[PDB]
From a paper:
AmpCEC was co-crystallized with CB2 giving crystals with four molecules in each asymmetric unit, all of which manifested clear and continuous electron density for the covalently bound CB2 at the active site. The overall folds and orientations of active site residues and CB2 are very similar in all four chains (main chain RMSD of Chain B, C and D in relation to chain A: 0.31, 0.28, and 0.33 Å, respectively). Binding of the bicyclic boronate core of CB2, together with that of the amido side chain group portion, is very similar to that observed for TAN (CB3 has a different type of side chain). Interestingly, in the CB2 structure, the side chain of Q120 is directed away from the active site in all four molecules in the asymmetric unit; Q120 interacts with a water molecule (‘w’, observed in all chains of the ASU), which in turn interacts with the carbonyl oxygen of the acylamino CB2 side chain. Although the AmpCEC-CB2 complex was co-crystallized using a different crystallization condition than for the two other structures reported here, because the Q120 side chain does not interact with residues of other AmpCEC molecules in the crystalline lattice, reorientation due to formation of crystal contacts seems unlikely. In a crystal structure of AmpCEC, obtained by soaking with CB2, partial density for the bound CB2 was observed in the active site, though reorientation of the Q120 side chain was not observed (data not shown, because of poor electron density for the CB2 C-3 side chain). It is thus unclear whether the different orientation of Q120 compared to apo-AmpCEC is due to the different crystallization conditions or due to a specific feature of CB2 binding. The positioning of the Q120 side chain could impact on the potency of inhibition by bicyclic boronates containing an amido side chain, as in CB2 and TAN.
Numbering used by the authors: 4 to 361
Write the structure that this text describes.
Amino acid sequence: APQQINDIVHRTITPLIEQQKIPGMAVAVIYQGKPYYFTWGYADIAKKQPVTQQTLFELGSVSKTFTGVLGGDAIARGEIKLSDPTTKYWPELTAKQWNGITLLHLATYTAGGLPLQVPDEVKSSSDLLRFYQNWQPAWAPGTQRLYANSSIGLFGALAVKPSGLSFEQAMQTRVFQPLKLNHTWINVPPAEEKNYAWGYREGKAVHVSPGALDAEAYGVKSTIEDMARWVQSNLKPLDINEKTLQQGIQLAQSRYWQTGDMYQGLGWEMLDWPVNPDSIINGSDNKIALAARPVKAITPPTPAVRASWVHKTGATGGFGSYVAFIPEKELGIVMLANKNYPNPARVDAAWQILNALQ
Ligand SMILES: [Cl-]
Ligand code: NA
């Protein structure tokens, strides 16, 4: 790796790991479009299994960027439109409150107060229907942004209906396989479990449990190599051979809503580069990132802006992830850790590295 990258990564990540007591971590820096990998610590403490470039991490909500791109791909194929009402694809929901909620609202958390988590007691398709049927919105659609698994998770489930594929099959055939993400999984195959790191919560090893819409909202596991390639693809979509996938990535980084300094894409979130680091650092705190905030529609949606800070945080019980990149600079970073540690610490480290390398 270039000496500049080694210097800043070891200056930044090494103190972070000790200060946060992170058992194992993998970092990829994309510099001038090429990836450079770094690994620390253990994927399994008890068995002393080290983290490698093959170690699988739970991505948590970084999975939402795959869902956003998969939906974008379906838009580009002419299968769905963001302005379509939810009831076109789930007619059993036909009701006053749901006729005015579109796929855009679901994809961008602007449906009007869909909850952060799907209740743990929702365990069947009938449970899920009844859950959305009896949901009482708090705001009119298109006025408030409330980050929610039950929002974009439903977008992913509905966006694949016209394809006739399951969500996993559509993701595998339309995103993972064309991009050669051969070690990225919604369901880890038996032969790959050996690489599945343990997450650690309060000194206990944990893996994320099955939940309704987990695959769409937080159920992807990946290696640092595949995630570096995911950043490469989102940095340089025009190099992708499949037109609809290139366009899906561009659609996912387009700006549909504005809240303060940030713009909402499909899965991805964007700010104008250069950014005020305090904005994204403090803005990643859950007291802020999970709060309801008013939105302004952007008309037409702004096409993917090159001078952007594009990023997404992710968390499960035992894992914490972060992805950020700057298309104008061909510059990005992936941070995967098997402990869920505060988002502001992730963003601070990521910005220090990318700002030093611009
Ligand atoms: Cl390695
Ligand atoms: Na609206």
